Write a protein that binds this DNA or RNA. Structure first.
Ligand code: ANP
Ligand code: ANP
Ligand code: MG
Ligand code: MG
Ligand code: ZN
Ligand code: ZN
Ligand code: ZN
Lengths: 41, 193, 157, 341, 175, 154, 340
DNA sequence: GGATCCGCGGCAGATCTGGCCTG
DNA sequence: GGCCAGATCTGCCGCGGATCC
C-alpha cells in the first residue's frame, strides 16, 4: 500500500520497527491524527 | 535493484549459495549468505555481488515433471551461455515466453525448441539456411532435417512465432549441434538419453 | 518549549520506544525541520461481515468472493500477507460458536502460537493446516521437534 | 510522576486483579501475615528497583513463573513496564520490546523504607562505609569505575608486597592516581549533602544531627605511603587509603551507635531516606514515589503526628502498618486480596 | 597454506588460534595424533569401529541425501529403520545422473514389501529426485511415501514464503 | 569412537572453542575426510635474527627511525594493519602482574636495551588495563633514567 | 526467689533512689528516651548478667558507678554490690570480694531484647554462635572442649598450609574432640526441641521445629580421610563440627527466607521462654524474667496470648509504650520512677 | 602489681549469583 | 556463549578485660 510505504519510509528517515509503527498508526487513527497534530504543532 | 531469472544454483561448502542470474541488461553471478530455481525474481545486489533483498514475482508449478525439468534446465543453460548484455533485452522476453510455453503447453518440446531457435538466431549464432544441416549449414552431411523440417525452420527464423507455431505443429538435434559447434560442449547434455 | 511536551508524550505512548528514545527523536527533529516537514507532507501520501479494515463500510473482500469459505485470522498482518498470497476465493474464537450459522466448512488461518493452541483446544466441518518441513535451505538447519513430527506425520503418496 | 495501575500473577502469596492508588497520601491496614510487605516489594520491583530477596524465592510454592505489570505516567508521557520472573532470569519489556536493565536507571523510580536502614545505622564500620558507597554510587558511574580500578590496584600491590620484591613505585603512583579522585568526590558530595539532612531532621525532632568523616590520607596518598614503610614491612599489608575511612552519625555531638535509643535511631534512618528522596527529586526534576513500611510502630504520639504532617505535602506516598492514620483514605488487606471501601 | 586452512573452518579467532598452535607444538602434535586416530558402515552408512557398526552386528527404510542427514534423523529418535546412503543428488549442471548414483547398490537391498521414506532436499532438484525415485519404485513394485509438506514449528505467517503457505493450504488436514 | 573422543578433547582444550562447537566440528570432519589431511599438511618462519619476532623469511617486516612497544603480536598486527605509521616494531613477553608471578626478568626488557642506538623517539602502545598502565610507568621511568623523550596514545 | 529492692548511683541517665517491684506480673510505661532500657539493663547487670562497653555505662562527666541489689531466695537473703570505673568491676558478695565465676552458679535472670531476632534472620555464623553459647550456659565441659578443638584445628591448619609434614597426631586430636562435641550437641538438641514446640503451640497456631546438619555424622577420621585430595588442594580442613548449620523451621520451611516480622518475633520469644523453663527445671527455681518492648509488632490476638502466658509466671516485668490492661503499672519520666 | 589467657571487632582473600556484550 | 561485576562466606591477627601469684 502506497500510504503504508510512504509512512515506513518517513519513519526510516530498522525497517521492522518502521513497519510495526506504520501498521499501528494505520490501525490507530486517533493516535496518528494526534501525532500529525503534534508534528504540525 | 534488478529483475531477472534464476538459472544457476551452486551450493557453497560453507553453507552459502552461488547464484547465477540474467537480466535484460546482461548476465551476472551473485552470492547469498546461508529464490527457487527458474523463478522470475526482482532482487537488489550489493558489491561477486552479495544479494540483500529478493522479491518473488511468480512460480512455474508445472516444472516438477522430470522431462519438463530437464528441458527447462537445458533451455536455461543455453540462454545463459548465449546471455550477452547486448542480446539480453531480446533474450529475456524470449526466455520468459519459452518458460511459460513449456510450463503450459501439453508438449514442452514444441515451445522449448521454438524459443531455443529464436534465442540462437538473436544471439549471433543464426544458422545459415541458404536437406541435412551441418555446423549450421545445409548440405548432404549432418542430421536429415527433411523438406518439412527445413521449411518449418525457415518459417520460424523469418515469420513471427504466432504463425511459426502451426508450421512446427529433429530440429532440436540440429540446434544442439550448431550450439556445440559455436560454443563447445554442454554440461547438461548428459541427462537426456 | 511546552509545545514539544505533547509530541514527546505522543511518541512515548507507541510501543517499542522508551521515553529517552522519544526525547532523542524529538530533539533530532527539532533542528532538522527539513525532513520533519517532508514527513508531515508525506504522511497523507472494520466491516462487521468480515472483520477487515478498509475505507468504506464494505471491504474489498465484500466488494467475486464466496461466503462458503471463512477463515479466522489472528492479526491483520497475516490478512495482508494472505492478500499478497491470493490462494482462497472465499471471504475473509469466543464468537465463533454464534457465527457457525451459514458456514459449512471452517477454515483456521490462525498462527500456531500457544494462544492459538489454547483457543483451538477450547473450541474443540473444521480444518487445520498440517505440520511439516519447509521448502529450500538445508536439513542441518532445522529443529528436532519438526524432524520428529515430520517423521510421524509422514504421508503416503 | 504518578502511578495508575498495578497487576500481578503468582507473586509471593499475593492473589488480586488490580490496584489503583489515589493521587496523594494513602494507607494500608492488615494483621500479621497478610501481604502488605509483599505488595510493597512487588511495586518496588516492578518500578525497576532492587529487591534484597533471592530471585528463586519470589514465586509461589509449586508454580515456576511470575508476572508483573505496571502503568505509570510522568510529565513527558505514559508508558508501560512489564517483568517476566522465571527460572531463566529477569527480563524487561518497555512498551513491548526487550530492554536492558541499565536503561531504567534513567527513569525516576521509587524509594523504599524498611528496618534494614535502621540496622545499617547501628552497624559496624564496614556496613556504614558500604552504605555511603552505595548511596554515592546512585548519582554517577565514574565513582563505580574508580572504585573498581582502586580495588584492582590495591589487590595487585598487596599481592606484590606479600612475597618477594619487584618494582614498587609504579603501583604506588597507580593507586595514588585514583585515591585522590575518590577522596575529592566524597568530600564534595558530603558538603552538598549535609545541610539538607540537617534541615530535614530539624522538622521531626528537637535535637541536633550531623555527619563526620575522618580520613587517614588527607594531604595525599603518596606522602602517607612513604611515611609508614616500616609498618607495611612488618605487617605486609597496605595501611593507608580510602578503603579505611570511618563515617559516624552524631546526635548532639556524640556517636549514634553507642548513645542512642530505638526511636531516635529510627528517626535518623527516616531522615536520611527523606533527604535522599529530596536530593534525587531535585536531580531528576521529578521526585520519585515514596513507599514507607511500618511507618509508626516504635514511635510515641508526638513523633507519629510529626511524621504524618511531613508526608502530607508530598505528591504521592503510600504508608503501611497495623493501624489507620486519622483522616486519610484506608484500604484493607486480607489473605492477599486488596478491597477498597 | 595456514591462512586458507584456518579460513576453511566454519578470521581473528582463526588467526589467534593458528598463532597459538605455532607457539604450542605439543597441542599440534596431539591434534595430528587424534586426526590419524580418526583416519561409513557398509549397510547403514553411519560411523563404526572397523567394518560393521554395533547396531548391524528392518521393515522400514529411510532414503537420505548425506550422512549428516542420517545422523540428524538418528538424533531425532523417531526412526529405528535401516538407511541407504546415496552419493548425492541428480544434477545435469554437474553431469550427475543415473550413471553416477548408487542405484544398483540400492536395488540389491530392496524387497517387494517395504516403505522408503523420501527424505530428499526441499528444492527443485530434490523434488525431481524424489519423484524420479518414486516412479522407479512404483515400477519395481514397492510403496512410495513422502514426508508432510507444511509449516515449520515456531514459524510466523508474515515471514513464510507463498509456496510454503500454498502447500500448507492444499495439504490441510481434518481435526 | 574413542578417536572422536580424543579429537573433541583436543579441540575443547585449545582456547576460543565451545564444547558444542568442538563436537559439531568433529562431526563435520567425520563428514569431510579430505579436509582432514588437508589441515594436517597445512599444519606444518621463525624468530627474527634481530628483533626476535615471527618473520616470513629471515627478517620481520619491521626491520626490513620510530620505535613502538607492544604486549603481543596480536596488537602488533592490529596496529600495523591500519598503517598510520611505519617504523621499528618491538614486542614484549606480556603484561606485568604479580598475582601469577611475572616480573621484569620473565619479560624481554633485556633484549630491548641492546638497540637504543639511533633512536630519537619511542611510543608506548599499551593496553588500557591497570597492568598496562603499570608497565608503561615502569618503562617510562627506566627510559627517562637512560634518557629518551617518550609519548603515549590518548 | 524475689527481688526485694534495688538501688543505684550514677548509672546512665537514671536519677532514682530505690525501686521495689511487687510479686507477680508488673509493667512499665514511658515515652521515647526516658530510661526503661537503662533500668532493665541495670537490673540485669546487678544480678550478674552479660552486656555496651564497660566504660560507656558511667554517667557523663563522672568516673564512679554504684549498683546494689537485695534478693531473698528460698533458703535465705543475701546482698550484692558492683563498682564500675576505670579500674574495672569489683563484685563483692555480702561484703566479701569474689569473682564472677561464683555468681555463675546463682540463678540470675533472663533478658529478652530486640537483639534476639538476629539469631533467627541472621547468617549461618550467628546461628551457630547462638547455639554454642546456649549450650555453654548449661555445662562447663563444652567451653573447654571448644577451646581445645579450636587450638588443635589452628595448629593443624597452620602446619598444612606451610608446605607439608607428618599429619598423624593432629588428626587424632581433632577426631577425639569432635566425637565428643557432636555427641553433646545431639544429646542437648534431643531434649530441647519438644519444650520449644509446646511453647510455640501455646503462643501461636503454626508448628515450629529445629534441624541440625552434620558433615561428619559417623566419624571425624573417616570424613577427613574421604576428602584428602581436595583438602590438600584447597589448604583448609573441610569437615568437622565447625561447619554445621542450624535452621529454624516454620511449617517445614526455613525461617530466614519466608517468615515475616511477627512470626520471627514470636519464634524468638518462644526460644527465650523455652530456655527460661529449662533453666528453672535444672537449677531448682525459675529465674526472674525481664521482657523489654513486649508488644509492638504483634496484633491483638498475639498480644493477648503473650499476656495470658506471662500471667502465670512467679515474677516478671514488662516495659512498653502502652500499659497492659488489668495489671499494676508504674511510669517513668526523665529517669525517675514513681508508683501509685 | 606483673603476667598468661580468653574472647571479639576488624580486615583481606576466595566463592558464587545474575546481568551483559559479541556473534 | 563466555567474561566480568559485586555480594556473601570463612579463617587469621591484634586488642581489651578478667584471673592468678
Ligand atoms: N513464596 C511464598 N509463597 C507463599 N507464601 C509465602 C511466600 N513467602 C512468604 N509467604 C507467606 O506470606 C506471609 C508473609 O507475608 P508478608 O507480606 O511478609 O506479611 P506482612 O503483612 O508484612 N506481616 P507482618 O509484617 O508480620 O505484620 C506468611 O504467611 C508467609 O508464610
Ligand atoms: N551514658 C549516658 N549518660 C547520660 N545519658 C545517657 C547515657 N546513655 C544514654 N543516655 C540518655 O538516655 C537516652 C536513652 O535512654 P533509654 O533507656 O534507651 O530510653 P528508652 O525509654 O528505652 N527509649 P525507647 O526505647 O526509644 O522507647 C539517650 O537518648 C540519652 O538521652
Ligand atoms: Mg511486614
Ligand atoms: Mg529502649
Ligand atoms: Zn467486508
Ligand atoms: Zn551399520
Ligand atoms: Zn626483524
Amino acid at each position: 500500500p502506497e500510504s503504508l510505504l510512504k509512512l515506513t519510509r518517513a519513519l526510516s528517515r530498522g525497517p521492522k520497527t518502521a513497519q510495526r509503527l506504520a501498521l499501528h498508526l494505520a490501525f490507530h487513527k486517533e493516535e496518528a491524527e494526534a501525532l500529525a497534530e503534534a508534528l504540525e504543532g | 535493484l534488478e529483475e531477472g531469472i534464476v538459472v544457476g544454483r551452486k551450493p557453497l561448502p560453507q553453507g552459502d549459495l552461488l547464484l547465477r542470474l540474467v537480466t535484460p541488461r546482461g548476465s551476472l553471478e551473485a552470492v547469498v549468505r546461508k529464490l527457487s530455481l527458474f523463478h522470475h525474481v526482482r532482487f537488489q545486489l550489493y558489491a561477486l555481488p552479495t544479494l540483500t533483498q529478493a522479491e518473488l514475482l511468480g512460480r512455474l508449478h508445472g516444472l516438477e515433471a522430470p522431462r519438463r525439468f530437464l528441458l527447462a534446465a537445458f533451455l536455461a543453460e543455453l540462454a545463459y551461455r548465449l546471455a550477452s548484455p547486448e542480446a539480453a533485452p531480446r533474450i529475456y522476453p524470449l526466455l520468459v515466453s519459452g518458460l511459460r510455453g513449456i510450463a503450459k503447453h501439453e508438449d514442452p518440446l514444441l515451445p522449448l525448441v521454438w524459443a531455443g531457435w529464436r534465442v540462437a538466431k538473436a544471439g549471433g549464432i543464426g544458422p545459415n539456411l541458404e536437406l541435412r544441416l551441418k555446423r549450421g549449414r545445409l548440405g548432404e552431411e549432418g542430421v536429415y532435417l527433411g523438406r518439412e523440417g527445413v521449411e518449418a525452420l525457415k518459417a520460424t527464423l523469418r515469420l513471427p512465432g504466432a504463425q511459426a507455431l502451426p508450421h512446427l505443429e529433429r530440429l532440436f538435434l540440429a540446434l544442439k549441434a550448431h550450439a556445440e559447434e559455436a560454443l563447445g560442449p554442454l554440461r547438461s547434455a548428459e541427462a537426456i538419453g | 518549549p511546552e509545545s514539544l511536551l505533547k509530541l514527546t508524550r505522543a511518541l512515548s505512548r507507541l510501543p517499542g520506544i522508551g521515553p529517552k528514545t522519544a526525547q532523542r527523536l524529538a530533539l533530532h527533529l527539532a533542528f532538522h525541520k527539513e525532513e520533519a516537514e517532508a514527513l508531515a507532507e508525506a504522511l497523507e501520501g472494520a466491516c462487521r461481515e468480515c472483520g477487515n479494515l478498509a475505507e468504506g463500510e464494505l471491504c474489498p473482500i465484500c466488494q467475486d468472493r464466496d461466503r462458503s469459505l471463512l477463515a479466522v485470522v489472528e492479526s491483520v498482518a497475516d490478512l495482508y500477507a494472505l492478500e499478497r498470497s491470493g490462494e482462497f476465493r472465499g471471504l475473509y474464537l469466543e464468537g465463533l460458536f454464534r457465527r457457525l450459522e451459514g458456514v459449512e466448512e471452517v477454515v483456521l488461518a490462525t498462527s500456531m502460537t500457544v494462544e492459538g493452541e489454547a483457543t483451538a483446544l477450547y473450541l474443540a466441518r473444521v480444518t487445520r493446516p498440517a505440520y511439516g518441513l519447509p521448502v529450500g535451505g538445508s536439513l542441518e538447519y532445522a529443529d528436532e521437534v519438526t524432524l520428529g513430527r515430520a517423521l510421524e506425520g509422514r504421508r503416503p503418496v | 510522576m504518578r502511578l495508575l495501575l498495578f497487576r500481578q500473577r503468582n507473586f509471593r502469596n499475593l492473589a488480586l486483579e488490580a490496584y489503583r492508588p489515589p493521587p496523594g497520601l494513602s494507607a494500608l491496614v492488615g494483621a500479621n501475615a497478610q501481604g502488605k510487605t509483599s505488595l510493597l516489594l512487588g511495586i518496588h520491583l516492578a518500578l525497576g528497583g532492587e529487591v534484597p530477596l533471592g530471585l528463586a524465592d519470589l514465586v509461589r510454592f509449586g508454580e515456576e513463573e511470575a508476572w508483573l505489570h505496571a502503568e505509570v505516567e510522568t510529565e513527558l508521557g505514559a508508558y508501560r513496564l512489564e517483568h517476566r520472573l522465571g527460572p531463566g532470569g529477569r527480563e524487561v519489556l518497555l512498551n513491548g520490546k526487550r530492554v536492558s536493565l541499565r536503561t531504567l536507571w534513567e527513569l525516576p523510580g521509587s524509594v523504599l523504607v524498611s528496618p534494614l536502614d535502621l540496622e545499617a545505622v547501628l552497624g559496624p564500620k564496614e556496613e556504614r562505609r558500604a552504605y555511603l558507597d552505595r548511596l554515592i554510587a546512585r548519582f554517577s558511574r565514574r565513582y563505580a569505575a574508580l572504585l573498581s580500578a582502586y580495588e584492582k590496584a590495591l589487590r595487585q600491590r598487596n599481592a606484590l608486597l606479600k612475597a618477594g620484591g619487584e618494582g614498587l613505585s609504579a603501583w604506588d603512583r597507580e593507586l595514588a592516581r585514583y585515591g585522590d579522585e575518590i577522596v575529592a568526590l566524597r568530600r564534595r558530595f558530603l558538603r552538598r549533602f549535609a545541610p539538607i539532612l540537617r534541615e530535614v531532621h530539624a522538622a521531626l525532632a528537637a535535637k541536633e544531627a550531623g555527619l563526620r568523616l575522618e580520613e587517614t590520607a588527607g594531604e595525599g596518598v603518596l606522602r602517607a605511603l612513604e611515611a609508614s614503610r616500616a609498618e607495611e614491612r612488618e605487617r605486609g599489608q597496605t595501611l593507608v587509603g580510602p578503603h579505611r575511612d570511618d563515617l559516624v552519625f552524631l546526635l548532639e555531638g556524640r556517636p549514634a551507635h553507642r548513645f542512642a535509643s530505638r526511636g531516635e535511631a529510627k528517626t535518623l534512618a527516616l531522615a536520611l531516606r527523606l533527604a535522599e528522596h529530596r536530593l534525587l527529586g531535585e536531580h531528576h526534576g521529578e521526585p520519585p514515589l515514596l513507599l514507607v513500611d511500618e511507618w509508626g510502630e516504635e514511635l510515641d504520639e508526638a513523633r507519629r503526628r510529626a511524621v504524618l504532617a511531613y508526608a502530607q505535602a508530598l505528591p504521592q506516598a503510600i504508608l503501611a502498618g497495623l493501624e489507620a492514620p486519622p483522616g486519610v483514605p484506608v484500604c484493607s488487606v486480607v489473605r492477599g486480596v486488596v478491597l477498597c471501601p
